[PDB]
């Protein structure tokens, strides 16, 4: 058996916990020895050893009453007594996909699924992500950015650059948040200024982005050095608007593949690979696009740890390619093994 | 008293250990309670509690025989029984300035000196660093970059782009190393190809850089949101060459301020601040420039944790401004406190 540890929760949990239930029930307990570590909202790490049956309800998860050892000892050793072959972060904290847990994993020399430090961190900062996309030549909506320090001195002058380079309406976006906290849509300077002031309560760096009305199209990418991209998918919505949040009850309504011309789909698959390379991803990414009704394409953002329930977009895009959810989980673990092995080979060849 | 922890060593140590001796002997043991954690080449963490006298020889450091508790307990609590007010990483491992230890620090919610995760990681990847410098408008030598995957398919085609955009000689540079391992200077394709092949043994991503002969000029930057830059300094060298390494015995020979026109110095101070902002630095950075004999300026790289002995360039640049080495250490701790406090204020205002 191989030795796996799923880390879930994070310093709101209900998605992460549902995800960890799905990932657990889709792992062959015959091929894998599975421990899990739950991170409480407090930040405390609680381990639960040796999952061996299906998790039918969240009650079966020890959660905050798990075994409360130091984080060092929790990750060094499987309950089986072997070191882990892969650790799978399914976190919904900021420490989830800002590169921080990945940094911990590297310091502890623990092999792990998904994106590395620089990749996760730069996909979480919206300014760095766009700067990397730009250098790579991917099309994006016209955009501006600045630090609070610059706006305190150049308010009047920054607003002019907005009206020259962009067309209203624009969106004010905090650079470093994982949440819709502080985003607003502004139809003029008056609203823009109010919006900028309003976002600086939550962040020190802002992106101003030209608005579009467009379809949201997502592509799943999987791999390390030779990644592959799925056919695109769509969350079907008769009306494009920024909701600020999923309000409709029940399952989300996916269309996979998306109802797009076959040429446009191929363009999006190739753009997804470019977006993966532009932030030097590992393991996986979801590329999220804006596609207007006249088939104009912009890349919106990448997502370094995308939604990963059994009905989420990222796994359902791979199902459409023939890759089962249990096969996808196993592939992510093998990629984690390979990236990890490739680093001692380099750390060795450095002598 | 405030509570400080110096982390030094790292998974070669002699500079880091000399540095930790200097930083220790320059801290007022009356104002600060000082513990230190030593990271062995093995990666093991060993704590030594409550430094209270001058460290006259490295023998007085417990080093690898320090107290061998789990890393979690080592950082959570000062020997005094209080949580730390600041942790000061003085590491010479890759885990030093690739953002990994900083990620650990954030996961453990430990306040810490210097650059954050994204800042350290992006200053260590030479491709991302140049891409950020470019977007900011700082002048750099003409350069190319590619992944191993791209060169395996486009060898012939990538070499042409080199000869069109650059002028020989060029330097082949691994993107992700902190070491001179795999750098070479090439006067033609024949050498370039050999050089590219030679660097791929140690890295998966490369930068090809146009060579210059120039003076090396360094500027020290200190601050968080309102940073300040020193007058520039110079390691004086009658002959510009890439040494691959300091060979001369004894002290390095600094000229502070550098023998440059007063206008050129002011330009470099302002470029240093731009370079700090371009990678969203915190705490400090050293901006390293190429300045030709005809006063043409290029930024070479930033250094997120620069040399920090008492005779290193970064502290000596601040001494020239009137800031003593003990005052600089204290300023770095206050900045660590401020960045840390500013994050709960935001994490609070996010509700």
Numbering used by the authors:
A (entry chain A), B (entry chain A): 3 to 13, 16 to 249, 251 to 356
Task: Please share excerpts from the published article on this structure.
Ddl is essential for staphylococcal growth and produces d-Ala-d-Ala dipeptide which is incorporated into peptidoglycan to cross-link the peptide side chains of neighboring glycan strands. Ddl has two d-Ala binding sites and one ATP-binding site, and DSF experiments were conducted with various combinations of these ligands.
To gain further insight into the mechanism of acetate inhibition, the X-ray crystal structure of a Ddl/acetate complex was obtained using co-crystals of Ddl and acetate. The crystal diffracted to 1.9 Å and data were consistent with a P 2 21 21 space group possessing one molecule of Ddl in the asymmetric unit. One acetate is positioned within the adenine binding subsite of the ATP binding site and the other acetate ion is positioned in the second d-Ala binding site. Also, the methyl group of acetate forms van der Waals interactions with the side chain of Leu145. The acetate ion that binds to the d-Ala binding site forms a bidentate polar interaction with the side chain of Arg291 and a hydrogen-bonded interaction with the backbone nitrogen of Gly312. These two residues are conserved in Ddl homologs and previous structural data clearly illustrate the crucial role these residues play in d-Ala binding. The acetate-bound structure shows conformational differences compared to the previously published ligand-free and ADP-bound structures.
